């Protein structure tokens, strides 16, 4: 049945889930929610996610939160619909290693950059130079390892596109709209790899759904 | 003519300007803009605001940025339309002092709190306890001074509602939707003063325009 | 064949892997390695782990790094040996959600505490009060959610002990040796749940292997 | 009557007020005060400034604090004496925008630099490299915008020297005595603009009053 | 001959040296110096102290910097004049241990507190709550150890007042003028010990020389 | 009798003491201790060191802690055995100044670097770029002063090797095993000076005792 994805359509963490839902060609609606923005604070969304973070997904009777837990659950549960995000042809050792690398090395460095360079200015604040510098450099070192790996593998886990690559898509997308898009562009294989991901029909759909504002 | 307010309708810094535009009963439209979110980064909004921050207001041939510069400009320029946000009956010494107090004591402590407790969770992140603690405490000390002052003055600058009070409205509003709403509630005069501001017809209009999401 | 676990036997991240290897009853040896501690710096371990972090595991021809990637790989690969860390009887939705909760909520708060209160003093430094306070409080909120969950489930994913619980063991162990052991003790179900984990024979073995120093 | 300016004559925030008092040619004395430096802490200056910060100015029966609130009050109150810091010939849109730019972009970056490079060493401490780097870079970006603006305007608000320029003087002065004086020097119009400000007779007087120590 | 002490008479690090010079009853003058405050930056005091920090002391042909290096040098060099700050009757093990404790535990926590609560407000800034909290708590734990020690020893190194105690005096003095003076007062022996130090004639002289401002 | 040095043989702060014990040719054993790593936390090592930090040294009936207090005590107490770490031929002014420089300028910058680049990766963590950058740069400026000094002096205090040089050895050793070893290598005299220290027989012994792991 139509899956319910709770969250703001602009949040890259919501887009990471939408990414996987389109690949699998599953039906779903993105439901925006008032976390606490209603005042007199008496815990409501806390019923879906007790940690009170977006996104959350309701799968019939199942409720899941943690975008990566959701992506993995959906990828194995609906293993047949759409793309096989967990190919048995992909290396299992590489697939598990790169899922964690994204979680612990790419994400923690990619998000602060998207936050300082995209979100803050939209809210009336100037990017924190110290935060940008620390993370741009850390992400650069991280992307040097992706570069050497991708020079030897078409995708993260091997010849085929898997969950490992899809989990990167929303943040690569947002990174490309910042002045730090060069971290990706300057690395040949990272760049090719990224351009291959954007070319994906499912991804095209996902991007199409982001309520991105119009120029000045 | 209809003023153009560039920015996201959810940003409290945009709401601070809308606050003053409704009091003056001026006509305007809030135009959302793509700051850099279009990639291949080649500076567009930078033409309105070279600092690249929201909001910006176009008044015919005039372009202004810095929400407080905009509010003051509009308050003196359209001095007659709607409320007199700069009454000659208000104390000039108090009016100037409390405009700066808001800028240097209230704002710097109120925004981090709104950011960590409202924005971050909407983006998939958990509030930073250290940031919340530092600022809740600093805002508390700041609000103890407002409390003693407001026990002796109906409004910040005196008997009447002025620009000094209006500049606080959007952030008091957002603060009320967080678990730190108590900083205001626990202080009798701050609370009365705030409740008086919400009662204002102009403010009612402003609140009405915020595209606040629906509950879970 | 005997798996090679590269790392210091005292590092909780190495112990998290050993935890899973004993449950599965697999054979392995923990090999301590010189990361860069040999000077004239010309990258050696970087061949196992290009990120240059411990631990790394060599499974015949396979090399994996990221303790959780290693644990998951071993848990599905050697699915039959020893305990079934991935029971098909466990809820799949809960199992995936709690694997991520540990990674994103428990770990990031548990490690700084172990680092400031255990490691630093061993190296001649005093714990940073600000770091301890921030994380003890964040971990406390996190453990309030575990408490409510564990009041309703024997283990994280349900009736049985799974990978989700095992991934917590080394850090719960180290936390218990700090002045913040109370975060666990003060929560009834968290405490029972933890005491159940220590009772496990496999865990007993693991603890037995940590080269913990003798009292003064 | 002779205005009383409470504060240390070396504090740039006190000098920012003195700057405006000399332009207006008003009479005043700078009174140094014991904030809390008398021990057994029982709040005294707190009567002038409840926030307990310097400077404070007593204008007969009026007490004001917040250096910029003081400068604006004096600039409009004594609108005729000395220089017209608020010319009706100056652009009102530019004047309000640049008053805020100084407050939110220049000041927050200029002060940390003066603090780490001038104050700390005088107190036995070494400058924090991270703080200097973050702010020198942020101030640099800020001064690139001043440069483009000043290439098109003689002064911030237009053809004439206004309050907007005067509010910058004390910090430009202190910045020039640091190793980061180059941020100003390297920008042609910023440099010319600054040199024009120092040439002002009123400013000459102000500088003359700072109790600056003698060389080694 | 009259020793030359370079530095501001208000800086507690200069007062720590003056403390020891008066005990020894040596003659000296405190010379205030322009560190870099002369602009066009071309290194002058750097000749006394290449680190460019205050204080520096010129002893005839000798130049020393690092307040504690100066205090120790003077204490052994002029071992006979005035008080024997290095009594052979004092425990040598205790004397060396408490000289380092002051340097590594007391000083690093006492100075941030004096800086945020005394210096910043004098310069127009509000104390950083996070910095005050972190250090007040760390100093509290440190003073609990002094309390237990001082319950068993009249002074740090034993029965007599030594260099170890004198090195604490200026910072205990400044701490007493802050809202955190209670850290000392609340600990019986620390308090008695401190009151004994203030009673010292030499110390009375030292305090007398600090150019402390008059009340409001 | 055989001195007991409490601590981990890998900790550079323990190695700083061992350094001085070998120079003096004293007998001792390095005893590793459980600080709190035994749980149910009821203070044991706290009897040697109430601050609960390593190392501690028991000299018969004497207990000392603070590595530098220990080094100085042993250097004067066993003044005759082995090397005279406190030569009366060395300049007393230079000797005291450089003991403090190491404590306040070298150590605080050298340790964070050893911690982020050596310790963290051994524990499963990535170096913090911001911390490395801040300290590498601060240490660089510090080493520029050592360079100019060492171009004029064979050793820190003069012609002979003293306690001042020995206190640097363990950290210079660890720094050499990091990617920041260049800070030393790139400075001619610092490099020569360091190479002279490693050549020392006593130092050779010390290095020999560090339980450094074998390559991958």
Count all strands of chain A and give the number.
4
Q: Terminal Cα separation of chain A, in Å? A: 40 Å
Largest sheet of chain A: 4 strands, mixed
- 3D shape of chain A: globular
EC number (chains A, B, C, D, E, F): 2.5.1.18
InterPro entries (chains A, B, C, D, E, F): Glutathione-S-Trfase_C-like (IPR010987), Glutathione-S-Trfase_C_sf (IPR036282), Glutathione_S-Trfase (IPR040079), Glutathione_S-Trfase_N (IPR004045), GST_C (IPR004046), GST_Phi_C (IPR034347), Thioredoxin-like_sf (IPR036249)
GO cellular component, one term (chains A, B, C, D, E, F): protein-containing complex
Family (chains A, B, C, D, E, F): Belongs to the GST superfamily. Phi family.
What is the structure about, briefly put?
The structure is a homohexamer of 216-residue chains. The first copy, chain A, has helices at 12-23, 67-77, 92-122, 129-152, 163-166, 169-176, 182-185, 188-199, 201-209, and strands spanning 3-6, 28-31, 56-59, 62-65.
Describe the protein's architecture and organization.
The structure is a homohexamer of 216-residue chains. Chain A has 216 residues and is α+β, with helices and mostly antiparallel strands. Chain A has 2 domains: 2-86, Glutaredoxin; 87-207, Glutathione S-transferase Yfyf (Class Pi), Chain A, domain 2. Helix content of chain A is 53%, strand content 7%. Chain A is built from 9 helices and 4 strands; from the N terminus they run βαβββαααααααα. The first copy, chain A, has a 4-stranded mixed β-sheet with strand order 2-1-3-4, with helices on one face. The N and C termini of chain A lie far apart (40 Å). Chains in contact: A-B, A-C, A-D, A-F, B-C, B-D, B-E, C-E, C-F, D-E, D-F, E-F. At the D-E interface, helix 1 and helix 3 of D face helix 1 and helix 3 of E. Chains A, B, C, D, E, F: GO terms for molecular function: glutathione transferase activity; protein homodimerization activity. Chains A, B, C, D, E, F: Belongs to the GST superfamily. Phi family. Chains A, B, C, D, E, F: Residues 1-82 form the GST N-terminal domain. Chains A, B, C, D, E, F: This is glutathione transferase.
């Amino acid at each position: 049945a139509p899956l319910k994805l709770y969250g703001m359509p602009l949040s890259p963490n919501v887009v990471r889930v939408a990414t996987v839902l389109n690949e699998k060609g599953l039906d779903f609606e993105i439901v925006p929610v008032d976390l606490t923005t209603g005042a007199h604070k008496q815990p409501d969304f806390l019923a879906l996610n007790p940690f009170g973070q977006i996104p959350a997904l309701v799968d019939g009777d199942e409720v899941l939160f943690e975008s990566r837990a959701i992506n993995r659950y959906i990828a194995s549960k609906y293993a047949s619909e759409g793309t096989d995000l967990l190919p048995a042809t992909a290396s299992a050792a590489k697939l598990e290693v790169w899922l964690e690398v994204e979680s612990h090395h790419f994400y923690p460095n990619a998000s602060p950059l998207v936050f300082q360079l995209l979100v803050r200015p939209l809210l009336g604040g100037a990017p924190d130079a110290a935060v940008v510098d620390k993370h741009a450099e850390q992400l650069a070192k991280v992307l040097d390892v992706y570069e050497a790996h991708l020079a030897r593998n078409k995708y993260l886990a091997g010849d085929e596109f898997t969950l490992a690559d899809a989990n990167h898509a929303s943040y690569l997308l947002y990174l490309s709209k910042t002045p730090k898009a060069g971290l990706v562009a300057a690395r040949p294989h990272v760049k090719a790899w990224w351009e291959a991901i954007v070319a994906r029909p499912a991804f095209q759909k996902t991007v199409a759904a982001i309520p991105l504002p119009p120029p000045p």
